Amino acid sequence: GIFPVACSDGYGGLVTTDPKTADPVYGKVFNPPRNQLPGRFTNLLDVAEACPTFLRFEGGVPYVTTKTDSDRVLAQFDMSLAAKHMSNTFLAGLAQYYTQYSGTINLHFMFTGPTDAKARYMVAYAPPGMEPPKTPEAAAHCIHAEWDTGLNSKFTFSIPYLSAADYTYTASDVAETTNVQGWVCLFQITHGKADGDALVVLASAGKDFELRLPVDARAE
Amino acid sequence: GIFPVACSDGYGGLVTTDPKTADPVYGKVFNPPRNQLPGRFTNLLDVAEACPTFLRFEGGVPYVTTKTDSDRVLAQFDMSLAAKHMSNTFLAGLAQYYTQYSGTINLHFMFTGPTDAKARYMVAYAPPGMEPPKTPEAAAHCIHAEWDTGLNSKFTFSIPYLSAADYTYTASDVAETTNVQGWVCLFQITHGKADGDALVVLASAGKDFELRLPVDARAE
Amino acid sequence: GIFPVACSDGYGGLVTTDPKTADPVYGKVFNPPRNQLPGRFTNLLDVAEACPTFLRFEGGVPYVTTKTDSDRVLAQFDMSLAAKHMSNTFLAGLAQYYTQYSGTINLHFMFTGPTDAKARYMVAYAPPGMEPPKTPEAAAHCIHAEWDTGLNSKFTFSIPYLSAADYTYTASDVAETTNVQGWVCLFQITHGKADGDALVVLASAGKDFELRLPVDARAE
Amino acid sequence: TTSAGESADPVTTTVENYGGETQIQRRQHTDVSFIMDRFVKVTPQNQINILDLMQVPSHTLVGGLLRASTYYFSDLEIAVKHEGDLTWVPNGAPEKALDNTTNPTAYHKAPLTRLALPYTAPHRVLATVYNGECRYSRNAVPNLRGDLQVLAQKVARTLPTSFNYGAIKATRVTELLYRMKRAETYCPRPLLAIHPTEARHKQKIVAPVK
Amino acid sequence: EETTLLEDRILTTRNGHTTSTTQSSVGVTYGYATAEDFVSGPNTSGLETRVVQAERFFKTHLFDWVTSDSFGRCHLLELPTDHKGVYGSLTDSYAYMRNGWDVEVTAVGNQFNGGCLLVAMVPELCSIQKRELYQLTLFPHQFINPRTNMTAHITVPFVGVNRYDQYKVHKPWTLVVMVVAPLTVNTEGAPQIKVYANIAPTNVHVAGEFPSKE
Amino acid sequence: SGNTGSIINNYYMQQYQNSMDTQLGNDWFSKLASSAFSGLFGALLA
Amino acid sequence: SGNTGSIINNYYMQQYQNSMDTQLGNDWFSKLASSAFSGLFGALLA
Amino acid sequence: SGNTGSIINNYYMQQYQNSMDTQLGNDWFSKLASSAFSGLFGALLA
């Protein structure tokens, strides 16, 4: 006799993501050598950490210019990977193919004014549950950093992952718990002759930034 | 109970090249002895190396006769296994069942004139990217060899594999990178009374000649 | 999950000769004892060797009678297992279920005349490629044996397997290489008063007689 | 290098003669066993088909390369699309045996039947070409001398009747493919590419999209 | 090779009580093997015998190479051919035979001729198209080229689907001489070159003795 | 042992696939074909 | 190594299931992301 | 050994899957291609 087998219902159809491999039909092929080719990446978050890309401010520019009036808000946007400010970053371009993230997102600020142009800035993370601060003074009570210009043109700041749940969504729907994470607030404290000078800002993934659950959702 | 099994979609149809064997139906047969039969070959490139076959020149002849005028070009053809000059060789007959090759192709030249007939010849490999040389002098700047007649009637020359890619095509389409590899140029430097004498030429596979990727494409 | 399996096309139909066994449905049965029953055979060629069966001569008789005239040909027939002379032998009855044989076939000759009846006979194997001999003298140049009558009534002779190929056919079509193997020639040299006496002849399989490739071809 | 051209002793130069370097070659694809071991379609007869490898068209890869050997050995696989049941009978069988089911018969199971068959000929090896006759009762074959013209006498010859892997029969056989198993080839013979009208034989080769 | 106006590439082949010597040798070509395979198989049931008296040279004229013969002009000789000596008588005394061939082909003109001959030993030669002549070097061969040599020597074994042959119905080998470059005579060459074969059967074995006509 | 050519053991017990044989307490024609006189009964000259 | 999750070995040889790679003689962006300055460039008070 | 690439052994015996070969008592063209003169027959200057 021969081995009896139950061919089971519910199993066997093609699944577009399944853990199995096709049957081979054309053997023995040997490839050209490609060992030590320059520029290999393994993990998309390696390049999301090592290469910051530019944010987008009103007008379709990667910078904010120092204003000279009584309004000290240079920028304010939603801590969302779906923000308009983030929409040209490599980070937002990756995040759209995943439904959840966790961890640190880093902002980089570069002063671009002449040597006789001086300024002092503040970045604050405003968590959800009340309205984002409109003044450096109200913002002082948030997790914040302040710095000024000098030899070193760049300052980098980690936006912290603070939420009730352990993961939050990359997509947004309508303002909820799982999809808005508050605001980031960029203020100018003062300046000395920096009128018109640009501060350009970039974002990169922090050391514990994590994207999980692949999704394809039309989009680019 | 019995062993449950998922009969999978996408697997199971006959493939004309597959790695599997049929079920046997007629056992126990013992063949007549055939050990030590003469003339066995294993690898078609063993016989492509050990047995050169003749090239074809205008008129449907395996030779070029030494001309006696100011034109010193004895032959010029495309380094293609699909060349008309190569079309009666064993090498071109093999190459048509493969889509790519690599390595050395060897040309053999045999002087067939009488003992009081002397000549000096040059073979040059002209690589693609400019027009093939029309004169021994222009051709001097290519990889080339020159030899004359004497005791030994045959000279053999390796055409080198020089291309951007690691493999090139055996078939040809329209002059491109992957299918034309330049020209081989056979010149006569001079002769002393060799008017009308034939030099016959053959080609065989070099030590690192390689054919890969079987293809059946109608053809013979 | 469960074990995935490719149910393959081309496999699975019933084959009338296949190497596999059915599934059992009615267990535990114990047979009556049958150890040491008389007369067992294992191999049909054991009984084809140990038991010679009679040839058939004109008239439907197992013998040739000694003639008394100038014609000394007692019998001449085709070395074919499909010969009419062989058609009532156990050997021809076996051979029809196989497409090829090899090896020795043995003929047995028994003198049946009275004690005052004496004779001398010759058997010769005439190989194909020319006409079979008509006289003992022409036949002398073949592989042959000659013997006479005396105490011992039987003489046995091995017909040799001589052919280009290693096997030959048991069936016949039209005179060819693979299906006619020449002739066997039985002559009478002389006799002393054996007029009318019968020599009866039998055939059995030789020590290296071999039948291969079973075939069912209607027939008996 | 110079050599004596008349000799026939193979001479293989390398690019080292002018400062190059011979590379490594991986020749697994021009191995006779591997390249011969793929199915090739044949045009079937309605019912009786005798299994004869010389039925595969000379232009195909397997027909091209099988004719480039004089003698060969292999076992065989066939895949057959047929109505009814398929009976196979070995080399040497009477053709009326094709109608008896104790001979290997495969019962119809859609879409086709694939079978492993042994070499059954009575010869140690078979030949793609054979300069002679198998019928006896004839007159002897001539010892021809002359030029190529002399070879035209031989055109009405069929390969010996023993050169086959048996025969198969079904009510209708619609498709038949052969596949040589464990192939051995002896004594190479000519292999011809297409002869071009032009300097280079040109074909549309498979290229990207637009 | 060796010396002034003529040469010392000097070979003497012996087959039986017959010898042949050339001073323009070039060597011998061994085809497909160096030895025959087994001579004593199942198909002869131990009844075969060697007949050493047939292993010796016999001679035949092949053709006359003239200036009008073009590339691809051939002369075939199927082997065995008519032999009126002891080899020839074996084919009428035994039903099955096997032997290889030691072949020597001559084309003597002088060193002021030009042109070239390919001599080859082809098995089972039933047909040869014109284009295949470009691949005749696939077969055991050697050239005759006047400026170098006048003799070709090929030594080939028995080959066949069967271990012993019946030569009255099958011819395993064909000697082919082909013109690859046309003969040139200039002012000093031989006006034409007659081509001759000197052939010896090697290792002849016979089995299956025939009746006589007596 | 006849015409069977599987390399793995039967999924079923031998008690099920076949009848079982019992004892109480080739063969003849093998012995018979081996016993055959293969010689010569004369005296052999040369 | 991608998205495959079978615990038994492939019925086919690796020479058949995949092209074979040859040698002559993560990577860059891993090294690049590891090399990142994570510190502080001031002097830290408190 | 040709184009076959299964990693487990055949369910059928080799006596069944293939004809069996017998003895009495690459190859030529391999030996022939290895024997090829690869040198130079002159004397080499520089």
PDB file of N, CA and C in Angstrom, chain D residues 149-180:
ATOM      1  N   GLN D 149      29.015  12.506 -55.210  1.00  0.00           N
ATOM      2  CA  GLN D 149      27.941  11.923 -56.024  1.00  0.00           C
ATOM      3  C   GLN D 149      27.606  10.477 -55.634  1.00  0.00           C
ATOM      4  N   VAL D 150      28.619   9.602 -55.538  1.00  0.00           N
ATOM      5  CA  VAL D 150      28.473   8.201 -55.109  1.00  0.00           C
ATOM      6  C   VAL D 150      27.535   8.014 -53.872  1.00  0.00           C
ATOM      7  N   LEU D 151      27.451   8.985 -52.942  1.00  0.00           N
ATOM      8  CA  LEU D 151      26.614   8.858 -51.735  1.00  0.00           C
ATOM      9  C   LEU D 151      25.063   8.933 -51.906  1.00  0.00           C
ATOM     10  N   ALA D 152      24.639   9.301 -53.117  1.00  0.00           N
ATOM     11  CA  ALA D 152      23.223   9.441 -53.491  1.00  0.00           C
ATOM     12  C   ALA D 152      22.522   8.080 -53.603  1.00  0.00           C
ATOM     13  N   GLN D 153      23.234   6.969 -53.791  1.00  0.00           N
ATOM     14  CA  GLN D 153      22.611   5.629 -53.764  1.00  0.00           C
ATOM     15  C   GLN D 153      21.908   5.322 -52.421  1.00  0.00           C
ATOM     16  N   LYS D 154      22.517   5.793 -51.337  1.00  0.00           N
ATOM     17  CA  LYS D 154      22.089   5.489 -49.967  1.00  0.00           C
ATOM     18  C   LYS D 154      20.799   6.183 -49.437  1.00  0.00           C
ATOM     19  N   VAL D 155      20.189   7.153 -50.155  1.00  0.00           N
ATOM     20  CA  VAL D 155      19.089   8.028 -49.644  1.00  0.00           C
ATOM     21  C   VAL D 155      17.741   7.368 -49.275  1.00  0.00           C
ATOM     22  N   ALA D 156      17.484   6.245 -49.940  1.00  0.00           N
ATOM     23  CA  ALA D 156      16.311   5.411 -49.695  1.00  0.00           C
ATOM     24  C   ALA D 156      16.485   4.450 -48.484  1.00  0.00           C
ATOM     25  N   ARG D 157      17.543   4.594 -47.698  1.00  0.00           N
ATOM     26  CA  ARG D 157      17.783   3.747 -46.547  1.00  0.00           C
ATOM     27  C   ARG D 157      17.129   4.342 -45.288  1.00  0.00           C
ATOM     28  N   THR D 158      16.568   3.363 -44.625  1.00  0.00           N
ATOM     29  CA  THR D 158      15.970   3.610 -43.357  1.00  0.00           C
ATOM     30  C   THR D 158      16.975   2.930 -42.401  1.00  0.00           C
ATOM     31  N   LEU D 159      17.122   3.552 -41.217  1.00  0.00           N
ATOM     32  CA  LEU D 159      17.945   3.101 -40.085  1.00  0.00           C
ATOM     33  C   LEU D 159      17.419   1.711 -39.703  1.00  0.00           C
ATOM     34  N   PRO D 160      18.271   0.769 -39.234  1.00  0.00           N
ATOM     35  CA  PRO D 160      17.878  -0.580 -38.901  1.00  0.00           C
ATOM     36  C   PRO D 160      16.642  -0.587 -38.031  1.00  0.00           C
ATOM     37  N   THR D 161      15.908  -1.676 -38.162  1.00  0.00           N
ATOM     38  CA  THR D 161      14.629  -1.816 -37.480  1.00  0.00           C
ATOM     39  C   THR D 161      14.939  -1.894 -35.951  1.00  0.00           C
ATOM     40  N   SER D 162      16.047  -2.519 -35.529  1.00  0.00           N
ATOM     41  CA  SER D 162      16.360  -2.558 -34.126  1.00  0.00           C
ATOM     42  C   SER D 162      16.682  -1.223 -33.448  1.00  0.00           C
ATOM     43  N   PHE D 163      16.830  -0.138 -34.166  1.00  0.00           N
ATOM     44  CA  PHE D 163      17.170   1.198 -33.586  1.00  0.00           C
ATOM     45  C   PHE D 163      15.888   1.951 -33.058  1.00  0.00           C
ATOM     46  N   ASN D 164      15.342   1.639 -31.893  1.00  0.00           N
ATOM     47  CA  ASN D 164      14.130   2.195 -31.346  1.00  0.00           C
ATOM     48  C   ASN D 164      14.131   1.857 -29.824  1.00  0.00           C
ATOM     49  N   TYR D 165      13.272   2.581 -29.093  1.00  0.00           N
ATOM     50  CA  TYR D 165      12.996   2.407 -27.679  1.00  0.00           C
ATOM     51  C   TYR D 165      11.590   1.820 -27.443  1.00  0.00           C
ATOM     52  N   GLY D 166      11.189   0.970 -28.342  1.00  0.00           N
ATOM     53  CA  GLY D 166       9.870   0.395 -28.357  1.00  0.00           C
ATOM     54  C   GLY D 166       8.838   1.214 -29.068  1.00  0.00           C
ATOM     55  N   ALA D 167       7.615   1.043 -28.720  1.00  0.00           N
ATOM     56  CA  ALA D 167       6.540   1.771 -29.341  1.00  0.00           C
ATOM     57  C   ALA D 167       5.430   1.961 -28.356  1.00  0.00           C
ATOM     58  N   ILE D 168       4.677   2.995 -28.574  1.00  0.00           N
ATOM     59  CA  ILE D 168       3.507   3.252 -27.717  1.00  0.00           C
ATOM     60  C   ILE D 168       2.246   3.285 -28.640  1.00  0.00           C
ATOM     61  N   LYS D 169       1.058   3.076 -28.111  1.00  0.00           N
ATOM     62  CA  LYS D 169      -0.182   3.161 -28.875  1.00  0.00           C
ATOM     63  C   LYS D 169      -1.308   3.597 -27.904  1.00  0.00           C
ATOM     64  N   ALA D 170      -2.226   4.488 -28.331  1.00  0.00           N
ATOM     65  CA  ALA D 170      -3.368   4.910 -27.504  1.00  0.00           C
ATOM     66  C   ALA D 170      -4.431   5.145 -28.616  1.00  0.00           C
ATOM     67  N   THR D 171      -5.678   5.419 -28.222  1.00  0.00           N
ATOM     68  CA  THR D 171      -6.726   5.672 -29.174  1.00  0.00           C
ATOM     69  C   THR D 171      -6.385   6.893 -30.042  1.00  0.00           C
ATOM     70  N   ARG D 172      -5.882   7.996 -29.465  1.00  0.00           N
ATOM     71  CA  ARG D 172      -5.466   9.181 -30.218  1.00  0.00           C
ATOM     72  C   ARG D 172      -4.259   9.624 -29.346  1.00  0.00           C
ATOM     73  N   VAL D 173      -3.114   9.854 -29.968  1.00  0.00           N
ATOM     74  CA  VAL D 173      -2.084  10.557 -29.228  1.00  0.00           C
ATOM     75  C   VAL D 173      -1.919  11.853 -30.040  1.00  0.00           C
ATOM     76  N   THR D 174      -2.139  12.895 -29.225  1.00  0.00           N
ATOM     77  CA  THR D 174      -2.165  14.342 -29.490  1.00  0.00           C
ATOM     78  C   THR D 174      -0.843  15.061 -29.312  1.00  0.00           C
ATOM     79  N   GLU D 175      -0.011  14.658 -28.350  1.00  0.00           N
ATOM     80  CA  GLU D 175       1.267  15.311 -28.106  1.00  0.00           C
ATOM     81  C   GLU D 175       2.288  14.305 -27.599  1.00  0.00           C
ATOM     82  N   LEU D 176       3.526  14.328 -28.086  1.00  0.00           N
ATOM     83  CA  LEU D 176       4.548  13.423 -27.621  1.00  0.00           C
ATOM     84  C   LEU D 176       5.858  14.214 -27.441  1.00  0.00           C
ATOM     85  N   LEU D 177       6.516  14.068 -26.276  1.00  0.00           N
ATOM     86  CA  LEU D 177       7.809  14.731 -26.014  1.00  0.00           C
ATOM     87  C   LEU D 177       8.778  13.683 -25.565  1.00  0.00           C
ATOM     88  N   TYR D 178      10.006  13.729 -25.943  1.00  0.00           N
ATOM     89  CA  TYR D 178      11.040  12.803 -25.540  1.00  0.00           C
ATOM     90  C   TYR D 178      12.019  13.587 -24.642  1.00  0.00           C
ATOM     91  N   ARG D 179      12.693  12.883 -23.742  1.00  0.00           N
ATOM     92  CA  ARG D 179      13.746  13.375 -22.871  1.00  0.00           C
ATOM     93  C   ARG D 179      14.739  12.222 -22.573  1.00  0.00           C
ATOM     94  N   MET D 180      15.933  12.533 -23.075  1.00  0.00           N
ATOM     95  CA  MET D 180      17.064  11.624 -22.960  1.00  0.00           C
ATOM     96  C   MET D 180      17.630  11.660 -21.551  1.00  0.00           C
TER      97      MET D 180
END
